[PDB]
Amino acid sequence: DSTECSNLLLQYGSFCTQLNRALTGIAVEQDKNTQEVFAQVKQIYKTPP
């Protein structure tokens, strides 16, 4: 909740966007690993009664 701080931070470069891209890549690779571990078969079987 500051305006001058943002004006001074915009002069540093692309650190904000770089950190955002890194965190987005982490968040995507988490779901990628979750799908690679469990979602190995594209067919949901069920046990007989």
Add this chain to the structure above:
Amino acid sequence: QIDRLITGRLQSLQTYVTQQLIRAAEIRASANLAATKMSECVLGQSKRVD
């Protein structure tokens, strides 16, 4: 005034080197996996599922 630019560019270089090191570690893991898959599937018959 020059000291601020020097510090900023040095920090940028350090961040780039760190990112390149992490990416090189990922590429090393991928290359080890690829070499293992080569030596197993190509130079022989593997009984490992998937």
